[PDB]
């Protein structure tokens, strides 16, 4: 077709607001102030193809998964209504994070104004997924201890909102603050260490290991750290500049770690939910 015809451009001719990673030398979309042109580019090969599709396929996966979760029989729940709500809040965070991300990546080349707006939604999306993930895991961890469940929900909410406020800053979007961005969101997820240590002190090592928490949490800690490390250090495009322009650059791999990370989190909290069903609501413990 002959409307909104465009070609890929080298990094050196890009405007300032489109230069996020100088290790991606060719294959960039040029600035196009048409939403029609931007949405059509999803089916074109460029630097954002992988970043778009990973969180587009990821968005439908969590939408379908979140739907099936609502239709599960309550015969299997110990409080289906308030239970389905905690998971719902995790699913809300997961869907918004992946929705804001693929939308940002699609309309990234539009204009400076549209790019600024969708980047702030993208960053805010990360914090919403971190806050949302804390809601189910905690409710089950502090099931018999409501006072610390309540405080930790307030702490992650104050930090998550603060992180969302930080994401409204202009200097935050710059490539100079790539590591600042990595540390802020890493610190948000790693803040979970305090509630985890409190849990281990109260319940003990055997409890934490037998329930399966120690394992699944270590995997979470790993995906969080490796994903942040790749993102911050621009691996592997740092080693091969001009060789990972389309496939396997740091951002694309990071997007994949998010999908796998949210799914691993779901698996763990789904298990805690099943463990609660076996022992029941009552706690003579």
């Amino acid at each position, epitope marked *: 077709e*002959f*409307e*909104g*015809r*465009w*070609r*890929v*451009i*080298p990094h050196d*001719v890009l*405007p300032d607001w489109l230069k996020d990673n100088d290790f991606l030398l*060719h294959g960039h*979309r*040029p*600035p*196009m*102030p*048409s939403f*029609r*042109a931007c949405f059509k580019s999803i089916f074109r090969i460029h630097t954002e193809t992988g970043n778009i599709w990973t969180h587009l396929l990821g968005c439908v996966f969590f939408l379908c998964l979140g739907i099936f979760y609502m239709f599960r029989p309550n015969i299997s729940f110990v409080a289906p209504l308030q239970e389905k709500v905690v998971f719902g809040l995790f699913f809300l965070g997961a869907i918004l994070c992946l929705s804001f991300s693929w939308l940002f990546h699609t309309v990234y080349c539009h*204009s400076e104004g549209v790019s600024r707006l969708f980047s702030k939604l993208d960053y805010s999306g990360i914090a919403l997924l971190i806050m949302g993930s804390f809601v189910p895991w905690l409710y089950y961890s502090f099931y018999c201890n409501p006072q610390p469940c309540f405080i930790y929900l307030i702490v992650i909410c104050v930090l998550g909102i603060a992180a969302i406020i930080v994401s409204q800053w202009d200097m935050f979007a710059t490539p100079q603050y790539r590591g600042v961005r990595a540390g802020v969101f890493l610190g948000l997820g790693l803040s979970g260490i305090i509630p985890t240590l409190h849990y281990v002190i109260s319940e003990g090592f055997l409890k934490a290991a037998t329930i399966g928490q120690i394992g699944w949490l270590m995997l979470m800690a790993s995906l969080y750290i490796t994903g942040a490390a790749l993102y911050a250090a621009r691996i592997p495009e740092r080693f091969f500049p001009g060789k990972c322009d389309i496939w396997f650059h740091s951002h694309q791999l990071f997007h994949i770690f998010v999908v796998a990370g949210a799914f691993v989190h779901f698996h763990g909290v789904s298990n805690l939910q099943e463990f609660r069903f076996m022992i029941g609501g009552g706690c003579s413990e």
Partner: antibody
Amino acid sequence: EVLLQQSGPELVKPGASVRITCKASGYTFTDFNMDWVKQSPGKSLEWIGDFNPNSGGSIYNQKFKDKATFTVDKSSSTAYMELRSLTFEDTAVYYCARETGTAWFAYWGQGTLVTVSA
Amino acid sequence: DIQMTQSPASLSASVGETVTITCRASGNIHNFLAWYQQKQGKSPQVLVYNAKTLADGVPSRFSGSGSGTQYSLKINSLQPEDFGSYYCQQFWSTPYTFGGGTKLEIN
């Protein structure tokens, strides 16, 4: 700097042919599309067509399909435009203009004046 | 083919004044619009692209606006070197088209 250098003015007879040269330097030739623009004396600009140095393909405006032929010399980063069966209507300043992803033109050649005279 | 209607066809203004050149596209061109300035005998130079993006080296006096089919080029505080011809161009649909031009004279 990016520079587009065209050949000098041409004075031709009716029914003759001309080949206009566009020498591009300062960037990777294959990376951007080259366009051709016509400007009749005292008149506005007209779009002849676009050429892709990487693919080798070209898109011509229906008005100039029989008039213009676009060629390329990849080795010397040069674009060419041949004008056939010239008439008095073809007396114009012909430009080469370079695209940057989308067809807005940052770089232009100095223009080649074609005068048809018997 | 998309037709580009540029208005006024010609105008004369004094130094320090503001001028507005309008452009009307026959169909939606989705902000894929460029503005050019041409000096007598010389080649055209890009002033504004993508409807409102100011090209490198171009004074802030020049501003492009509009959307859909109605676009505008504004020149605040006219300078003596601003004389010449002005052209709009759409690059949304092929064949690409230019406006009829606007001749600007300074007093």
